[PDB]
Amino acid sequence: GSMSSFLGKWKLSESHNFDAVMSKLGVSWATRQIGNTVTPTVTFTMDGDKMTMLTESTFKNLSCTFKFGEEFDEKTSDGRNVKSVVEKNSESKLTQTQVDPKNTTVIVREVDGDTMKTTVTVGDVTAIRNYKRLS
Ligand SMILES: CCCCCCCC/C=C\CCCCCCCC(=O)O
């Protein structure tokens, strides 16, 4: 099936330069501190033309469901209403674009074996967050 390497659960293992990106996004001090501490678990399932990503943490539990190439409305974990689309780059890579009125966030997720690397870019600032596959 499609995106089969994404399927299952993933837990954040490492984060590099993430404060630079939320700072740039205008995220509140207090939510930024939570964002620099919590280690979420992310679950992907693929059900038809649709992928679902569930994010679970002590802060918030959050889900989104999408068709590739199809714009949709999203509220981010920090509370911003954004227009997003997720594009399929390959069976092992997808790119999510989130457009708020102040900024645009590009989130690339690429699976390589037991690592999902998530690259987050807002203008000229980039963060990389590595997730390990669970079980
Ligand atoms: C990883 C998101 C869950 C963290 C919740 C705490 C609040 C985070 C603040 C701003 C998030 C906006 C930046 C985009 C996050 C996606 C990155 C990812 O999947 O690891």
Q: Looking at ligand 1, which residue's alpha carbon is closest to its atom 13?
A: 22
How far is residue 21's CA from residue 5's CA, in Å, rounded to a whole number?
A: 27
Cα angle for residues 73, 74, 79 (degrees, 5° grid) = 135
Residue 5, token pair as written in the block: 């390497």
Ramachandran angles phi, psi of 113, nearest 5°: 65, -120
**Domain total in the chain:** 1
Cβ count near 84 (within 10 Å):
19
What are all long-range contacts of 46-51, with beta carbons under 8 Å and residues at least 24 apart? 46/1, 46/2, 46/3, 46/4, 46/6, 46/7, 51/3, 51/6, 51/86
C-beta of residue 118 within 8 angstroms of C-beta of residue 12? no
Q: Is 36 annotated as a binding residue?
A: no
The verdict on the CB of residue 51 being under 6 Å from ligand 1 is: no
Q: Which residues contact 64 (CB under 8 A, 6 or more apart)?
A: 52, 53, 72, 74, 84
Q: Is the CB of 22 under 6 A from ligand 1?
A: yes
Q: Is the dihedral of CA 99, 105, 110, 116 positive or negative?
A: negative
Tell me the technique behind this structure: X-ray
Which residue type does 24 have? K
Domain residues for 88?
1-135
8 Å CB contact between 85 and 71: yes
Q: What is the CATH number of the domain that holds 13?
A: 2.40.128.20
Nearest-atom index, ligand 1, CA of 31: 7
User: What is the Å distance from ligand 1's center to 23 Cα?
Assistant: 12
